[PDB]
Design a binder for this molecule. Structure first.
Ligand SMILES: CCCCCCCCCCCCCCCCCC(=O)OC[C@H](CO[C@@H]1O[C@H](CO)[C@H](O)[C@H](O)[C@H]1O)OC(=O)CCCCCCCCCCCCCCCCC
Ligand SMILES: CCCCCCCCCCCCCCCC(=O)OC[C@H](CO[C@@H]1O[C@H](CS(=O)(=O)O)[C@@H](O)[C@H](O)[C@H]1O)OC(=O)CCCCCCCCCCCCCCC
Ligand SMILES: CCCCCCCCCCCCCCCCCC(=O)OC[C@H](CO)OC(=O)CCCCCCCCCCCCCCCCC
Ligand SMILES: CC[C@H](CC[C@@H](C)[C@H]1CC[C@H]2[C@@H]3CC=C4C[C@@H](O)CC[C@]4(C)[C@H]3CC[C@]12C)C(C)C
Ligand SMILES: [Zn+2]
Lengths: 70, 33, 180, 52, 346, 32, 50, 99, 35, 93, 18
């Protein structure tokens, strides 16, 4: 049932995303660089997740799914 | 030669097997058929 | 209560606006040294027009101050509480239209920020009257905020219980078991 | 120590318990840069010191 | 070209034979030490002086879509559109305004409108320059329309102006293009006073102590000039935007605007400088890391006294786009005429 | 916020001019 | 609040000392010194006082 | 397209073979879990052989430091130290035995 | 920690236990549905 | 001049994630480097036009790491219990 | 859902001690 609504959401959001094309590539950059090094976590949640997080493993995961090479 | 890096590449490093991998290699070649 | 709190703060804010505006002679505009040494009033003092037009505004906020002190000390038991609906319009309609002009005073090219002793009370009273109209439309009972805070606290309790039982120490471990 | 580098102590060694046993690179950089740069306050003019 | 593309610093060997050990030159070159920065290139004074960076800053202001109000929560409603600052050639300022207005009480000099008329008329002789940095993203069309609207009104209420009179022809230097004449002229006999007097005997006599022989615009040249200027302005909104497809527009194809060509990227800045005889030079500079920044020369128009006077008044006239900008400009422009300079590079 | 720094600039500039003129008059008078 | 409710078995209300200990220590010495600045910067301009 | 898919898969397997076999110059091999005589150096307790069998600086330094840094205040600090240490050990044991 | 948890001996124990658990579950299914 | 940007990361800020330009051998990658105490590294970094970036670096050190250390000590038991639960109950229902 | 009732009660013992 997610596919039927996903079809209507696709075209609905496609033009809204194609409109900006600059904020859409600023927020994506910020979001990616912020999930890479989880250094925003202490001031926002109180648990400093940067001590147990591995940026290299996340970068390798990203590139692996980008190139499809496990 | 002036503008060459001396840090080779990630790609032009050829594989070299240790002894355990040599053993695995000969086994996988003999049980091939 | 809540509407009582709004009306109380309205009377005291307007009281302050007057007691500060008139009990002192007048303000002095920013000099802005070097502003076209000729005319156009740049780097100058103030004048009759300004002073008196302002002395007016003070009287307007006094009028609404007295209206609000009357409504507070009269319907603080909120004679008959309802037909005050008349005065209510007179306290809301004006208010919103006032705010309208203020909401476009930046587009009008006015300097509203250099002098706090005049625009502060106007903006604050417009906001207070508008939120009073809003709260009178839906009747915040001064106990509904208690229900709101209890809802958010119940949600965050449900959150920390899940967190504690999943990541720190199971609830089946730390609590005692019966029958043996 | 006699050469016995470490030991057990029955006291919990809080630096491990709170994770503060590594020294924050900038601190070490500062300490070393100040160790390898001895300062001369006197001047060889007043004190008749001609050689290092 | 590729060697300059990188920055690799290759030491040089001492041309005396024995060992050829590298020379003790070294050096970090505080301009190159400044790549990787974002805004500007911190350069520590004397380096900026020997680099011929003679345009001090005089004033800062902004062009708002909406000025913020204290009384709204925090004043977050105030949306800025541009950040403006002004620069002026400090040696020429100290030579021009430093002979007459220097040596008096600054407030007393600021009190009379003669100084104001001076600084509004003596602009294009100092090479006055104005920089506009886009505080946010901006579509091009609205910017064009707003600038036309805001400058046409100055262009109409513009009176015939006072212009300086040419004391010398100053031919270009054909054989040696670089060769500049002034190092000789200011020490021509080392007593250039009387020779300059003889030079000005031909054209006109300096109307004051500053040395400028002014000239008010005639009954003519004050109506066709403004007409041609209005013609130039009326050709703006579709020159930058010809046709409906932005892909063919000039700014499309360079990082100054979005890849879509429809919005001006935040951080890009426009530079406008004014030469004396009605010359306007406009350039653009992308924003971001100092190492990858670009610079474009857009157009170098000539002969529009109307445009020069209109912009000089729009920034420093009796009714400008922001008052404290021009006030501070006049003040710290009086500042270096007393010998010193802003940003004390001595 | 530049205005305040400008005030201080003009104060110091006037003090500079005035102090030098005063010392000039005084010293040249002492010579003559 | 959640952990005390789970441990002691009753929700702390202004009638009980747990509420006031939590209030004073927690709120007044950890959350007040910055919520105060937030309010003094963003909500008093929404009123008349400067 | 399926034809290109199949030919690409064949050449990929051939590249992997070549890299496992000799000097091929653009590929990355995959590694495998090792399940056999892994480690080998842990099956054995050899502490008693290497020290030829055939911790005072610790406590001194701890106590001297809490003395030196912060009347009868040293006694309060020392009692606090000892008490909190014993309580840590007891809490650890009880929490363990509660599973 | 994971190097200690997924050691080969522990891995073989997990394998054996999973096999026996699957066997017993499917036997429960078999004797239940044939009833 | 092959490196574009370095990003110091970690809780004590001695690892960097260097990014290489397009002219580098192998194109553009991200490589992790662990750094020894060398007091000449930062001058070398800035005088070659490298965007050197740091973290947030909290000043407490003991209130920052205290809820993450509690987790480092408590999570292993949760992992072990979940694994054995999977085996002996999610299968042997 | 071990703690909801204590809030619904509003927005709607070691016998050996004694
Ligand atoms: C969205 C972002 C979240 C991605 C989902 C993460 C899946 C959770 C499972 C692994 C994360 C566990 C974790 O946070 O603990 C932190 C884990 C374990 O942490 C490591 O634990 C080790 C065990 O001894 C050691 O203690 C190490 O010191 C400690 O760092 O480390 C990481 O997760 C580092 C980042 C690796 C990220 C890999 C990509 C995420 C996995 C793919 C998920 C697909 C999602 C789509
Ligand atoms: C945001 C809001 C909060 C969300 C929290 C998200 C999770 C936060 C904590 C997760 C990481 C915990 C920790 O750092 O690891 C510390 C422990 C190791 O214990 C430890 O191991 C340490 C040694 S070492 O790190 O293993 O080398 C040792 O120092 C320590 O004493 C010992 O306890 O690591 C683990 O328990 C996590 C293992 C990875 C989890 C995935 C499981 C894989 C499925 C099974 C196959
Ligand atoms: C918040 C406090 C967080 C402080 C933890 C700092 C590092 C913990 C080191 C413990 C090492 C013990 C061990 O060798 O680890 C081994 C040990 C295994 O036995 O690990 C464990 O079991 C861990 C036991 C569980 C710890 C959770 C208890 C903390 C919170 C106490 C209850 C909340 C109290 C009530 C709140 C009152 C509100 C006013
Ligand atoms: C207007 C106030 C001020 C803007 C300063 C700029 C935006 C003005 C001053 C000089 C002008 C140009 C001179 C030559 C060009 C090119 C020519 O093709 C047509 C006319 C045109 C566009 C002129 C129009 C745009 C220019 C740059 C503030 C508001 C920024
Ligand atoms: Zn030792």
């Amino acid at each position: 049932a997610w596919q039927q609504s996903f079809e209507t959401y696709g075209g609905k959001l496609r033009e809204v995303l194609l409109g900006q094309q600059e904020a859409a590539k600023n927020v994506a950059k910020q979001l990616d660089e912020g999930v890479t090094y989880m250094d925003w976590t202490y001031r926002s949640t109180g648990v400093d997740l940067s001590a147990v997080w591995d940026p290299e493993l996340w970068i390798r995961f990203r590139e692996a799914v980008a190139q499809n090479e496990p | 030669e002036l503008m060459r890096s001396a840090v080779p590449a990630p790609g032009e490093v050829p594989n070299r097997n240790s002894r355990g991998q040599v053993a695995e290699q000969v086994r996988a070649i003999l049980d091939q058929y | 209560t809540v509407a009582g709190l709004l009306l109380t703060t309205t009377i005291v804010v307007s009281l302050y606006g007057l007691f500060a505006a008139v009990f002192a002679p007048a303000p002095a505009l920013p000099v802005a040294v070097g502003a076209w040494p000729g005319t156009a009033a740049a780097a100058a003092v103030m004048d009759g027009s300004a002073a008196g037009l302002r002395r007016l505004a003070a009287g307007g906020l006094l009028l609404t101050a007295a209206a609000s002190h009357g409504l507070f000390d009269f319907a603080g038991s909120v004679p008959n509480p309802t037909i005050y609906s008349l005065l209510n319009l007179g306290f809301v309609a004006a208010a919103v239209l006032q705010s309208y002009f203020l909401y476009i005073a930046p587009a009008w090219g006015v300097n509203v920020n250099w002098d706090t002793a005049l625009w502060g009370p106007m903006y604050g009273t417009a906001f207070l009257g508008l939120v009073y109209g809003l709260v009178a439309l839906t009747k915040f009972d001064w106990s509904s905020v208690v229900d709101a805070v209890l809802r958010v606290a119940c949600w965050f309790a449900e959150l920390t219980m899940w967190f504690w039982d999943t990541f720190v120490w199971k609830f089946s471990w730390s609590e005692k078991t019966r029958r043996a | 120590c006699g050469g016995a580098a470490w030991g057990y102590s029955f006291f919990p060694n809080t630096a491990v318990m709170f994770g503060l046993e590594r020294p924050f690179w900038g601190d070490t950089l500062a300490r070393l840069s100040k160790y390898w740069n001895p300062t001369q306050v006197a001047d060889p003019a007043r004190t008749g010191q001609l050689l290092p | 070209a590729a060697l300059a593309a990188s920055v690799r610093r290759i030491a040089v060997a001492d041309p005396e034979d024995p060992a050829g050990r590298p020379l003790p030159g070294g050096g970090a070159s505080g301009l190159d030490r400044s790549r990787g920065l974002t805004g500007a290139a911190h350069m520590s004074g004397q380096e900026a002086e020997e680099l011929e960076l003679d345009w001090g800053q005089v004033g800062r202001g902004a062009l708002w879509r909406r000025r913020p109000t204290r009384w709204l929560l925090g004043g977050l409603d105030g949306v800025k559109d541009w950040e403006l600052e002004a620069y002026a050639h400090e040696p020429l300022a100290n030579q021009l305004l430093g002979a007459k207005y220097g040596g008096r009480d600054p407030r007393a000099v600021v009190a009379d409108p003669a100084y104001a008329a001076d600084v509004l008329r003596a602009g294009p002789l100092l090479g006055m320059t104005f920089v506009l940095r886009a505080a946010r993203d901006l579509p091009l069309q609205e910017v064009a329309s707003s600038w036309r609207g805001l400058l046409g009104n100055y262009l109409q209420r513009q009176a015939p102006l006072s212009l300086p009179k040419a004391v010398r022809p100053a031919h270009l230097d054909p054989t040696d293009l670089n060769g500049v004449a002034w190092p000789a002229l200011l020490s021509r006999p080392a007593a250039a006073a009387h020779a300059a007097a003889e030079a000005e005997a031909a054209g006109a006599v300096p109307d004051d102590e500053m040395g400028v022989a002014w000239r008010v615009q005639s009954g003519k040249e004050a109506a066709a000039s403004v007409a041609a200027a209005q013609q130039l302005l009326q050709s703006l909104p579709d020159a930058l935007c010809p046709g409906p497809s932005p892909a063919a527009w000039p700014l499309t194809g360079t990082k100054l605007v979005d890849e879509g060509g429809r919005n001006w990227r935040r951080g890009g800045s426009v530079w406008v400088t004014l030469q004396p005889e009605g010359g306007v030079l406009v350039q653009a500079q992308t924003g971001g890391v100092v190492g990858e920044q670009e610079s474009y020369l857009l157009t170098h128009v000539q002969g529009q006294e109307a445009l020069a006077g209109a912009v000089m008044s729009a920034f420093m006239g009796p009714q400008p786009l922001d008052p404290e900008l021009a006030a501070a400009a006049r003040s710290v422009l009086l500042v270096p005429a007393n010998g010193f300079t802003a940003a004390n590079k001595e | 916020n530049d205005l305040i720094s400008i005030k201080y600039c003009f104060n110091n500039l006037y003090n500079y001019i005035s102090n030098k003129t005063a010392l000039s008059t005084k010293n040249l008078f002492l010579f003559s | 609040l959640a952990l005390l409710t789970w441990m002691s078995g009753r929700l702390p209300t202004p009638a009980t000392p747990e509420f006031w200990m939590l209030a004073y220590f927690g709120f007044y010495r950890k959350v007040w010194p910055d919520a105060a600045a937030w309010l003094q910067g963003y909500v008093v301009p929404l009123m008349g006082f400067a | 397209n399926i034809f290109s898919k199949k030919i690409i898969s064949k050449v990929k397997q051939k590249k992997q073979k070549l890299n496992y076999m000799t000097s091929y110059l653009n590929v990355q091999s995959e590694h495998n879990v090792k399940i056999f005589h892994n480690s080998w150096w842990t099956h054995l307790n050899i502490k008693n052989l290497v020290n030829n069998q055939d911790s005072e600086f610790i406590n001194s330094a701890i106590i001297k430091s809490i003395n030196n840094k912060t009347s009868s205040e040293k006694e309060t600090m020392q009692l606090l130290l000892m008490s909190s240490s014993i309580l840590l050990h007891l809490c650890a044991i009880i929490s363990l035995v509660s599973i | 920690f994971l190097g200690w948890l997924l050691a080969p001996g522990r891995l073989e124990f997990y394998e054996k236990a999973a096999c026996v658990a699957i066997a017993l579950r499917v036997l429960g299914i078999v004797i239940a549905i044939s009833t | 001049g092959h490196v574009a940007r370095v990003r110091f990361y970690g809780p004590e800020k001695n690892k960097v994630m260097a990014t290489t330009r397009a002219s580098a051998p192998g194109g553009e990658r991200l490589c992790k480097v662990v750094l020894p105490p060398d007091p000449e590294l930062l001058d070398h970094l800035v005088s070659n036009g490298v965007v050197v970036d740091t973290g947030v670096t909290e000043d407490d050190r003991l209130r920052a790491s205290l809820l993450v250390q509690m987790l480092r000590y408590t999570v292993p038991f949760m992992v072990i219990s979940g694994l054995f639960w999977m085996i002996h109950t999610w299968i042997l229902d | 859902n071990k703690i909801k009732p204590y809030f619904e009660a509003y927005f709607s013992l070691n016998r050996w001690s004694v």
